[PDB]
Design an enzyme around this catalytic site. Structure first.
Site, PDB file in Angstrom:
ATOM      1  N   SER A   1      13.362 -36.953   7.947  1.00 41.08           N
ATOM      2  CA  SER A   1      14.710 -37.376   8.332  1.00 41.08           C
ATOM      3  C   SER A   1      15.002 -38.796   7.827  1.00 41.08           C
ATOM      4  O   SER A   1      14.890 -39.007   6.620  1.00 41.08           O
ATOM      5  CB  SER A   1      14.855 -37.259   9.847  1.00 41.08           C
ATOM      6  OG  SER A   1      16.220 -37.245  10.214  1.00 41.08           O
TER       7      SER A   1
ATOM      8  N   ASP B   1      20.239 -26.919   8.909  1.00 39.31           N
ATOM      9  CA  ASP B   1      19.911 -28.299   9.230  1.00 39.31           C
ATOM     10  C   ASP B   1      21.054 -29.197   8.679  1.00 39.31           C
ATOM     11  O   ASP B   1      21.130 -29.425   7.471  1.00 39.31           O
ATOM     12  CB  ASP B   1      18.535 -28.706   8.669  1.00 39.31           C
ATOM     13  CG  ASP B   1      18.135 -30.125   9.042  1.00 39.31           C
ATOM     14  OD1 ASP B   1      18.981 -30.851   9.618  1.00 39.31           O
ATOM     15  OD2 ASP B   1      16.997 -30.531   8.706  1.00 39.31           O
TER      16      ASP B   1
ATOM     17  N   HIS C   1      16.366 -28.751  12.506  1.00 40.62           N
ATOM     18  CA  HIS C   1      15.894 -30.065  12.067  1.00 40.62           C
ATOM     19  C   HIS C   1      14.606 -30.492  12.786  1.00 40.62           C
ATOM     20  O   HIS C   1      13.917 -31.404  12.320  1.00 40.62           O
ATOM     21  CB  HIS C   1      16.991 -31.122  12.308  1.00 40.62           C
ATOM     22  CG  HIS C   1      16.635 -32.458  11.743  1.00 40.62           C
ATOM     23  ND1 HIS C   1      16.548 -32.662  10.379  1.00 40.62           N
ATOM     24  CD2 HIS C   1      16.316 -33.604  12.382  1.00 40.62           C
ATOM     25  CE1 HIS C   1      16.183 -33.925  10.228  1.00 40.62           C
ATOM     26  NE2 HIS C   1      16.036 -34.532  11.406  1.00 40.62           N
TER      27      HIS C   1
END
Ligand SMILES: CCCCCCCCO[C@@H]1O[C@H](CO)[C@@H](O)[C@H](O)[C@H]1O
Ligand SMILES: CCCCCCCCO[C@@H]1O[C@H](CO)[C@@H](O)[C@H](O)[C@H]1O
Ligand SMILES: *[P@](=O)(CCCCCCCCCCC)OCCCC
Length: 220
Positions: free
Chosen positions: A134, A186, A199
């Site tokens: 991320s 996601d 995610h």
């Protein structure tokens, strides 16, 4: 979303959401940290270089320097796939704040590029692998953008989980040595800000990511 994030980042400086955002992120981090200690998950790694070394930048609100959701599972799968060859894991020490995610985490990319140079200088024989999840994937992308191709050619592999810059290659580096793991649905991979269940499940791709790294960490 880029202009949305640019605007939201300005709002984070109006003395309002600033403290509110930070506290919420800190609470999420503590909750994740509490779960880590309960299941014996190591959220912090600062190993000396091994035969293979992974420099991993965690996600926003991830506790310690590797978090709980992704990093630990990838390191475990990688060490299993490497057998007797030692894996040294180093977490990227950076705030992993919502504010830095919204602004593009530029400063953190500068620091991580210097950390890569420092590791390459200290352990010239290690097989260096970069990993991110991320916001950490953004940090890795920024780090690559701050390094020359000669330095990036010394990196054996790059693994990005839930890459916010999905679609853009890792700068100054051979794309054949990169694995970007981005789940369908996601929103982070779509350049968005919405955290959804796809995610949070990148630990399921730990074996696949380890399998990708092994042939790249040589040879010979
Ligand atoms: C199973 C369905 C519940 C999944 C909840 C995931 C928890 C993350 O929550 C998300 O955090 C984001 C932070 O940027 C916010 O923008 C989103 O509005 C929020 O839903
Ligand atoms: C709400 C937080 C989401 C947690 C779900 C993580 C998905 C679990 O994924 C698991 O990961 C392991 C690899 O480490 C594999 O051995 C398992 O087959 C896989 O199902
Ligand atoms: P990335 O940096 C990853 C952020 C993951 C947040 C974790 C939520 C907590 C859920 C715990 C499950 C028990 O996302 C980019 C957007 C940041 C705003």
């Amino acid at each position: 979303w880029p202009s949305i994030n640019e605007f939201l980042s300005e709002l984070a400086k109006v003395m309002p959401i600033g403290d509110t955002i930070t506290a919420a992120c800190d609470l999420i981090s503590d909750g994740e940290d509490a779960a880590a200690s309960l299941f014996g998950i190591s959220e912090t790694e600062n190993d000396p270089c091994g035969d293979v070394t992974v420099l991993f930048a965690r996600g926003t609100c991830d506790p310690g320097n590797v978090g709980v959701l992704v990093g630990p599972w990838f390191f475990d799968s990688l060490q299993t796939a490497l057998g007797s060859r030692t894996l040294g894991v180093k977490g990227v020490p950076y705030p992993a704040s919502v504010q830095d995610f919204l602004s593009g985490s530029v400063q953190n990319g500068i620091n991580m590029a210097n950390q890569i140079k420092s590791v390459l200088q200290s352990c010239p024989n290690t097989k260096l692998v970069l990993g991110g999840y991320s916001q950490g994937s953004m940090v890795v992308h920024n780090a690559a953008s701050n390094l020359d191709a000669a330095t990036m050619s010394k990196i054996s592999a790059v693994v990005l989980f839930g890459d916010p810059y999905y679609g853009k290659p890792v700068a100054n580096f051979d794309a054949a040595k990169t694995l970007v793991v981005c789940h369908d649905g996601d929103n982070i991979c779509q350049g968005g800000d919405i955290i959804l269940l796809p995610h949070l499940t990148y630990a399921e791709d730990a074996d696949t990511a380890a399998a990708f790294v092994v042939p790249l960490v040589s040879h010979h």
